[PDB]
Amino acid sequence: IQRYVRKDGKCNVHHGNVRETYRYLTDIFTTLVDLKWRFNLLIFVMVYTVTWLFFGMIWWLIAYIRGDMDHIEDPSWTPCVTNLNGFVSAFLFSIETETTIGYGYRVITDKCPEGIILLLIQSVLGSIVNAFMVGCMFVKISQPKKRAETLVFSTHAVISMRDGKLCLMFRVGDLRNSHIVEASIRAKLIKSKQTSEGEFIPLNQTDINVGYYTGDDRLFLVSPLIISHEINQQSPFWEISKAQLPKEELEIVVILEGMVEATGMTCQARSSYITSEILWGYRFTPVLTLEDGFYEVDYNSFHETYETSTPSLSAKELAELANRAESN
Amino acid sequence: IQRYVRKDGKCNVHHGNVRETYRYLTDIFTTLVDLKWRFNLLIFVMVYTVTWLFFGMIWWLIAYIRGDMDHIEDPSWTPCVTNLNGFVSAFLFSIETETTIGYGYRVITDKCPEGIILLLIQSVLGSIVNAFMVGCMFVKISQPKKRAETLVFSTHAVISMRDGKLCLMFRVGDLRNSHIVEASIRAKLIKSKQTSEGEFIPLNQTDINVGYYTGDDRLFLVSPLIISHEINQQSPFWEISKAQLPKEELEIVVILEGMVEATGMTCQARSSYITSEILWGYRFTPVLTLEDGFYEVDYNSFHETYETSTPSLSAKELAELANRAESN
Amino acid sequence: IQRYVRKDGKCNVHHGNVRETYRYLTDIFTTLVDLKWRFNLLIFVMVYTVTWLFFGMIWWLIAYIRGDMDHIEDPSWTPCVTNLNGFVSAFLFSIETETTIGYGYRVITDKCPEGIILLLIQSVLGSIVNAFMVGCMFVKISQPKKRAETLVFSTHAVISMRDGKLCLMFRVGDLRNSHIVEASIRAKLIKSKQTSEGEFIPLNQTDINVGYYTGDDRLFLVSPLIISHEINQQSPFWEISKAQLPKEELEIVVILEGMVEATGMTCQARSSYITSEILWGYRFTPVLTLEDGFYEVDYNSFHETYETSTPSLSAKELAELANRAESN
Amino acid sequence: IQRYVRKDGKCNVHHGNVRETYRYLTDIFTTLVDLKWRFNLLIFVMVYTVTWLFFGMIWWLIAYIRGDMDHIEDPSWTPCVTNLNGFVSAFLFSIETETTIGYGYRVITDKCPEGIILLLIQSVLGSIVNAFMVGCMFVKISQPKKRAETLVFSTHAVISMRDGKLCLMFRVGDLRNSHIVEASIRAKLIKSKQTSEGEFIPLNQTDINVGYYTGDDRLFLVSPLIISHEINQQSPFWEISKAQLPKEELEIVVILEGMVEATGMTCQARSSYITSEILWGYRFTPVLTLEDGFYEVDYNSFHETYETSTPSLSAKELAELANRAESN
Numbered sequence A, B, C, D: 001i002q003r004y005v006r007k008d009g010k011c012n013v014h015h016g017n018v019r020e021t022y023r024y025l026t027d028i029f030t031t032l033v034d035l036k037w038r039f040n041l042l043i044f045v046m047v048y049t050v051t052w053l054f055f056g057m058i059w060w061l062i063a064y065i066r067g068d069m070d071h072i073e074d075p076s077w078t079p080c081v082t083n084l085n086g087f088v089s090a091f092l093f094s095i096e097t098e099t100t101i102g103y104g105y106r107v108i109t110d111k112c113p114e115g116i117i118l119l120l121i122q123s124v125l126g127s128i129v130n131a132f133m134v135g136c137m138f139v140k141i142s143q144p145k146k147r148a149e150t151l152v153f154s155t156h157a158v159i160s161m162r163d164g165k166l167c168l169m170f171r172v173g174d175l176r177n178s179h180i181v182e183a184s185i186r187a188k189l190i191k192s193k194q195t196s197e198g199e200f201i202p203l204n205q206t207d208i209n210v211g212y213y214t215g216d217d218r219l220f221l222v223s224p225l226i227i228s229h230e231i232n233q234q235s236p237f238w239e240i241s242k243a244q245l246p247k248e249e250l251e252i253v254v255i256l257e258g259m260v261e262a263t264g265m266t267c268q269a270r271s272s273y274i275t276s277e278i279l280w281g282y283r284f285t286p287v288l289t290l291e292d293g294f295y296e297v298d299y300n301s302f303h304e305t306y307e308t309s310t311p312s313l314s315a316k317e318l319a320e321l322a323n324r325a326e327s328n
Ligand SMILES: CC(C)CCC[C@@H](C)[C@H]1CC[C@H]2[C@@H]3CC=C4C[C@@H](OC(=O)CCC(=O)O)CC[C@]4(C)[C@H]3CC[C@]12C
Pocket: A038, A039, A041, A042, A045, D124, D125
């Protein structure tokens, strides 16, 4: 069914029917960084080609006007530029001058004013377009989101008993020897609902408690961790039976944010579970082993889960039964 | 009337009558980045032109003193620099040397000491001014605040009933396929007040509760969201009637902060509502539709709002009426 | 007296008698950025001068060995490099080759192997030292802390009554048209104390409540603000009389942190008050004026304060008197 | 014994048996930055050498085909490139063209089409590989984690009485004249445990209270500080006797995070204590001295600790004894 979030992070939403599009041209840098590579290269070449052509054109015009083309065959009458007759020669000179190569077969002289004022503008413009092009490139190459490709989440989550408390649990793990600095995790329930006055809301978001009160969510991630949300009176699962579970339609979205270690940027990873991944009455398998002063991880059992024994009642019923017993 | 915040973000304040102005010259980089473009280009050219002129001047002087100008017509007596007689020639040589072009029609020799010690200084100075100029440029081009141009807020907000609770609501939406990482929202009331001892305060700021206690304000922004503040005993709207609303003079300022996804910088967007946008007894229109495994947004109804039925009493009165009823 | 913090931010502490100094050479970049300018320039020149000399030396040796110096006067017998006889010539060639100038009066040939393998190493080394030198420079030029030079604090703070509550107040203001993103403020009391078992502590730090509970400290800074800490049962001023104030010895340190708007870095400003700035029974003067759709700030009255009437008793006494009255 | 964290920060964990390895090739930048230097230099040279060879090859082919090698000895018949006959000549020309040197002994002409379209591609490719190589280098040189080398922690921590409260204390200090902006500290207990249903957990993490509730953990670090966790009913040390301490097996991990001052990146330092560093009944030695308007630190007594008198009972027993006494 429609998930609203794919199992890897991509979201299923189509922004359509926008009127004010000039906004895209106001922050041209972000639109430039968001495009694919096939287009970035195209724009790069086009800009560099247009800038070179325009300045070659200006050079050719400044030459023709001066009248150098009418005295190409003459020892005296020093011209503006040396060995510059054809249209191609000017293009070559412009390329050789802007990229800072300067072979030296065709050189500028000191008896042609306004050549200096053209060279100045060309040199400045070339230095301005270089940083803008190279900065865009670097920015696009070194973005942080790619790190989220190596932050493994877990399979279908589980619901089980723990110290007389019903809990919902899932697993998260890393995949490198570096560190995620200042990591943190949160989780939201998405499920349509209707108010008591008539209003209908397509999709409602509600936070789930994972340790935001006791500061227990700022996790220290080295080995695979198991996150667990306890079911209490404030949780949206306060009244859910083992048989009533498949009859509902909801979704759980989990988000993990942190900072890369090499650079200092922020990265984010997402995941979701719909209804067919909430397995009732199971446990995860241990993955840590101790060998000669080291701890070995398996990663072959990262998703493996086994079965156990668990009551089949809503936590509200569990409380009543307990309370009554205590009283009597 | 005076809003103290324009409907798009600009603030109406004039900082005047400052004495210690040298502070502006202590952090010259920020003042350089804050200026417009028309001036940045001017400064760029002026600096580059002055640096080139000064070094050309030094070259011309070092030459004249040596006495090369007195033996321009002589095969022997190797000079300091080749083909360097006029003042223009030195300027050309300085340009060609600092920007790293080096045509080769005029070259340095190896029988003129102190030429090396001048070339060293020139090369270092040129490399120091290049990074400072290019870094300023890049910094100014790639700033994050421009992203705030594509973060749409909503029109006049609404006040309506919800599950027997009076609530104040407004709407926020995105405009791209990227993500705002670690987003968050807050809101402040601005309204003049007089203490109980005589002191008068021009403008007072007071926070409004939007979910700071339960961690419900760290929103996950994909589709247009509706933010809602519940009116309870702690809210500054505890005693406000439908007829008494237009008789007051206040303002609500809303702020949203986050991190761009491409880079790792922070961006902020603001908005305000004065008194003529607090519409009593209305609702927003749904904007989500489901089509063939995708969710389509409209954005043509983003501002559209319709009317409904709602009591006309202050929440304090609503409580009393309820309490009394329950009792009896 | 010894303040432990100067009125502008500098701290009076001397780190002495360190044994393991090699730590400074482990993070050589921070030590490089922390030095003054006079030394940075020196290191820059020395590195560039040593790198050029070493490679010129290698070139001169590779030439002498080949035996080119023994056939300087010969048309045939193509040498390794052209016009390279003296020691100075090699230095010039190395400079011209590493900085990417390439005049062309002395050129490499294609009949001298190992010249390519030297040019490769030279080109790579030069490109590696260039980014390291230019990056250090840029980093040092564009640091954020300089912004703290334009974040004005206030003069001696005040203590006064407000709605039957004793409060301690001071003032903070900006000095630009930009914005401080995600600003926040905190304050600590520093005062020596002796436990009840014998231990003596030189200087003790204790936080002061300024709005950390209700999220009221995340301020929105446009015009000069007045920060106010209410004196309640949990404040270290619970028992302090008007006459007993000058008899104590304490200090208050205030800290404000935020993010610059142009870049995305973090900046911090500090200030302190000792005992002679806590003025009892005063108020600040308004600074805002309204003129033709704008709000004008004065900044000539930013420090001006006037006098008023206030009881002279500790807040504990104020409570007792009130309680007793209410009872009777 | 196995510590799970070394006394300096390195962690003892071996990630093994991974199946999907292509993930490493999806975020090639992080893998490039994570390697050692010995390999980075190797990759740098290999890339630069391959790029130069390929383009030299293309040049040699474009020349041979044109038929220039068959008319090397002819005054007329202008060729494509000048003085380009052997395979080495093309390599030299490619090097001289891509690195922007341009000696000028061998030059391009204006009667050989497709030379421009080759030069364009070469120039663009060279500018794209330059920023990618130099950016990687700079990124690797200027990383923040190195600062953690100069953030001294303390030796074995202590447990002692303070105002009738049992507390656990340790020490932290800096080592420079700069500042750590927005510092903060946290601490976790690691110790295996078995639930009440059969499940066994290898290593369990549980937060320890250090001031997260009153905002007292956001420390202002100038001189050596002493962090102290009070033992109350909610602490995992609620039932631990002086004799029962060595009989347990646990570990305490301490983490400190902040922002460097020069740049704006985030740094993190870690440390651990196992069981043999929890010394019962001791105190630290003062390290501050006052001299002529300055505060001198010693750093020779940073680890020195002395002995004192303290009861030997669990805090639970201390409470009972007190309660009983009060009652009677
Ligand atoms: C060799 C590099 C350093 C410089 C020159 C490379 C470009 C001239 C080439 C490389 C791949 C080519 C692209 C391959 C992909 C396409 C898609 C192709 O067909 C489509 O656009 C279908 C719709 C779509 O692809 O989105 C149109 C040409 C184009 C843009 C090509 C544009 C020219 C590109 C970018």
